[model samples]
Target: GANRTLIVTTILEEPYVMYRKSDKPLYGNDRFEGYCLDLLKELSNILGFLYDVKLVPDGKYGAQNDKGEWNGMVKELIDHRADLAVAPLTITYVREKVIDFSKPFMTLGISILYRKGTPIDSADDLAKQTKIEYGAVRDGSTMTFFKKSKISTYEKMWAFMSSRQQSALVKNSDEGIQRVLTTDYALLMESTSIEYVTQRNCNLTQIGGLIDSKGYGVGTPIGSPYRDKITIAILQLQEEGKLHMMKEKWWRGNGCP
Candidate 1:
């Protein structure tokens, strides 16, 4: 309804959603800016609904514990704390089982993040090497790469990686990127994030093509009334080519090749 003011939950992830810097102090939604923010504005224009933008305090995209308890943005939606989760939330089978996802707004894949000088022809090449160190977020989807790998070599490769005492695992993608900058390490993360990071940091680069492709979707609690409307808005944006424009504006930075 026009009177409804939905609470939208998001995260601070580079070009997706970040704190906007300015000499003048900003308040509320003006305090933030990024692709998701723009998308939210456009969606509001089309949907004729008002929304309050807020960040997820825990800073997690959401992951389930062994006890089956949900945390992060997923928890927020599951508990009805937020009406919509408007970030780069990946749409996975595990997630779909618990929440409703709008049609994917963006498609990306897993890729390797490394320093400019380091040469990695492919993820397979990295898998074959033992001297150089590599890592992925301990709780992220990248961690499942080996588990879901169809390639036998990568399966063996993961065996060696897991056996190492200094496996170089990190808490999140930011830490993984930091480790790549600070140490002789390679981080496996989403292609979209790698593209965003490489644009901001010229010294960082993605080594190979995607390992596995996936899409990110808008998240809502199961059976939420907004999911259908949100999906329609996303499809309209895609049909009108606005979604592609948004990606180009945000992902292809000045420094990117």
Candidate 2:
């Protein structure tokens, strides 16, 4: 118990698990402080375990994880380097291959974000326009899904629109929506996160509907003893209304209405 109660973590999105406004890239202290952090603490308290969280870049985590190395927090659990990782990791096929996930802690969907005035009614609408440019948060789930699709147009859309530079990026769907509201290009991202932006800004709105129905899950290396245990804990939290409470906390002004 006490002998094996450490964890590793990585930042998935800003204000969620990001480094707390620092210049150093290697410091791991200011990590794990968001809705996901609450979930982790709740789980640890309930399950009677202790954890030591660490942060690392997504590429290194992905690379070592792919190579069966578990040096990174999330990958560590899979490789047995650590016990678990609760970064806002999405439940997906590729991820499921290496790690097990707790029952989805939150639900999300894909949606199109355009500068405020773009005429796109649905994600499918993007396919019809040969000249309309599209972009998304770099290394984000949205971009990953777009790249995974077999459709050449999706690839072309991402290829033509995607950029690593922040100035080149729209920051979020709200910014993207404004860009499209005033310009011609559009952005794509998760509906929940986009909804957060749109609710605060009167000019922006999510187009059509969700592009993908995905769940955010707490993850551990596959076959870890804690996977099922954490899954059950999440279900209990959902039953106790705590899950919905957290949802309102981070996503209060925006949701399916």
Candidate 3:
């Protein structure tokens, strides 16, 4: 398998991976452009490797189900369907047990996203009352943090979410944002996502400071030789301010006033 074309698995998320709109339909790499795609372009050029991009069949970021099955980009790596995963996939303890992650390319934290008129300024406010509903994404790292936390506030939040059948947690960010807009609900999710949302939706704003810290990284199969190589390139990019420059290109001009 010398010089094999790497299959890179990514998710279609805004500001990370979005289908570039055009007059004529685009295909292959030309069809997508966003921060992650830009990052991939830099990585591929640095490594001098030919790669193909594929979206994760399931629209999930990846988490383990009750029966020990996974569904998302993480599973694609575990199943060897793709040689690498370059998405906004968070680096987590459990995920690292199965797949390898490069050193963090971007750092962020868990926080709140809610309507602009909200009174609650913190996660504490959400937990202290039952007047409004609050929850994280279903089968995502944000929910996983609450589920695994020893902190009483987060633990209580997790309990509330788990006991409410399926209504409490959203299937994805889109669902959660809709819920926030339609009702008095606070969405607990990553700050980076909050940044993207609040920038475009003036009615929405980030409610509190980060609750937990983590970073997005490149994923590879366990024992992958590419991990170290990718990791090195990421470090180089960071040192040269390329990562910072790329982020501003996508995130700045589009932000709300």
Candidate 4:
């Protein structure tokens, strides 16, 4: 096989993808490190190729606009600007329409992220008590789950949350986490992200198991030539427990309880 240098697009997020501290300064791949970097290195070693790590310019994981146009790394992969998206891109049915994903390298789901001393343990507990201020990303999957669920409890939960006005709704996880840090609020977000944060920040922790489970997959454009090969490589890594090892290294930092 001919040598190749592929463009691997990712977003900057702690534990998953983050800038490494350095005194002498660094650039390119050397400037960054985390779970994704280690995963990329292993993939390159197994697949026999070189890669250039590039940050997704817009920093969004990817989403559809009103016009049905895609943005972020999805657009990059669709436009052929990036050979692969090696971030914690969630594998959803909507995203699958325009992109292909390798077998899930990781599985996670919606969960409550609250300050360490918070008594709220789960969405159920919060809903039953209704004493603490809680919220989820306005247009995020957790809210969507509540809104669309046929389950009676979740349907009512949706009504309660939506009725609270914009003050309770957050724009993103950062905002949610910030509110949790300073106030008696619980933010609903992905469990994997919660794990990453809790491991790094002693002040925060995830309360319970997932509210809704989903997998995070390696993404490529529809019909990408590399998809099958990457899928196989990922499976190999999983079977050998390398994926678990990497998660333990990056997501279970000393701060984790």
Candidate 5:
């Protein structure tokens, strides 16, 4: 196909996507700035394409129901309403089935809960434990990883979590962290999210190395011509240093580890 205007879907999130705050009014893509927007501009230049940015109507990044249907940017791509979903949209097992993702533009992964004097040392350590209960955020990618993983260690951990679903799985990160403080539970979640909690509360720490590594990428409708093109553009950006360069420009944190 010849060059055409593409609609890009994104969610409003700190440091990734955000509205430009100013006294004067801004319009269209001009109203936005952040790391995600930076990548889009680069993509356009690299691909010689035109793109328009739109917020996901529901404001959710993405989530699926029991019926296998999804909402947010994923649904938009499935419906062919958007050509690209470029934000901190996570790359997960179920997501890639319905939509295609580029090589992870930025890598991220999981980290385990920490309390001083705890036996847990790694995710494999979590796999072996029975007395100290552990789990991840319910209805989120953190939990989805275990449910879908094929590795022996993760599969083993998932079996334990599935058996005590009620007590193990928490409704949200807040609840999971609270359980860690109030009871003998170790929370599992994305490492960046864990970074925020560990900073203010010294008792709870960001311990254990990251496991089940994942990343975020540009999402496209299945078989969209842009899918492969975008992947090439992404890795090009990586090799030339635009990936981490743009991230450091917008990343809004500098607290101690």
Candidate 6:
């Protein structure tokens, strides 16, 4: 084998990976900064491999393979166009077939977003009550967990399950929180992301608390030879205080402390 440059594709997701919407330099001080950036920087230092990070749209991130669109991030890795995918990718069965994930660098539970005055407290309330509608990132881990698990609490909710058209798949948690605050719609999103949004918006509160423990991990093509190496680096980051620092750096702006 020859020494090759690894192309790591990702989405400019906020509190995870994002650049200023304004067109300014996206490196160094203002270049790249997020929970994943600091961790990836350390990973690169340990791996001793040169890598490139490219940004793509969050929605198209999963469709890079089935379609030829470069707008998506993870799809590029699955199609072998890139060697690594390191966004806040949640581990799921459907993704496992096409990609392999490192040990979760971080974990967060699921939570629901509702209006400030919405009459809901927890999942128990969700199961018994149907007056309010829930939304999430369509095809996201939250909704998928509901669809896959035989959890009795989720069985009672009413929804029209669609690919990427449901309320579940809003642009991000902030939008969901805004909708919840402005309308009667409730959005279910990652607990961490939702918490970030709620702290910024005074009108919203995380319904109940975080759901079961869920983790976000680094992912590579299913058979990529570097799987073990990447996972090892992730663990190192976890052991060091670097991981917590990275989380703080991103959350600082989103009101996450």
Residue-level lDDT tens digits of model 5 in 1-257: 57678899987655677889989999989999888899999999999999999998876556686797887788999999999999877798789899999888887788887676666778788778887788986656777788888999989988987777456977656688889899878888777656656754567876678886789889999998888898899989989998879866765455554
At residue 237, candidate 5 shows an lDDT of 93
lDDT tens digits by residue: candidate 4, 28-110: 89988999999899998998879999998876677676697887888899999998999888888878999899888998898
Tell me how many clashing residue pairs each candidate has: 0, 11, 0, 0, 0, 11
Candidate 1, poorest ten consecutive residues by summed lDDT:
139-148
Model 2 global lDDT (CA atoms, 0 to 1): 0.65
RMSD of 6: 4.1
Report how far residue 177 has shifted in candidate 3, in Å: 1.6
Alpha-carbon runs more than 4 Å astray in model 5: 1-3, 112-140, 146-188, 192-205
Evaluate model 2: give its TM-score. 0.75
**Cα lDDT of model 6 by residue, 207-230, tens digit:** 887877868878788788788998
Per-model C-alpha RMSD: 2.5, 5.1, 1.5, 3.0, 4.5, 4.1
Tens digits of per-residue lDDT for model 2, 50-111: 77776644433332223545433446566566567776666777667777888888888887
Higher-scoring candidate on TM-score, 5 or 6: 6
Best by TM-score: 3
Q: Give Cα-based local distance difference scores for all models.
A: 0.84, 0.65, 0.89, 0.81, 0.81, 0.68
- Which tens-of-lDDT digit does each residue in 1-257 have in candidate 3? 77889999998777899999999989889999999999999999999888999998887888899898988899999999999999989999999999999999999999999888757888888888877888988777988888889999988888887676458888888889889889878899898889888888889999879987899999999999999999999999999999999889878855566
User: How high is each candidate's TM-score?
Assistant: 0.88, 0.75, 0.95, 0.84, 0.71, 0.80
Please rank every candidate by TM-score, starting with the best: 3, 1, 4, 6, 2, 5
lDDT of 1 by residue, 146-221 (tens): 6557788668656765666776767667787888889878888899898788888889889988878899999999
The better candidate by lDDT, 1 or 4, is 1
Candidate 3 vs candidate 4: which has greater lDDT?
A: 3
Q: In candidate 6, how many Å is residue 188 off?
A: 0.8
The alpha-carbon lDDT assigned to residue 231 of candidate 6 equals 85
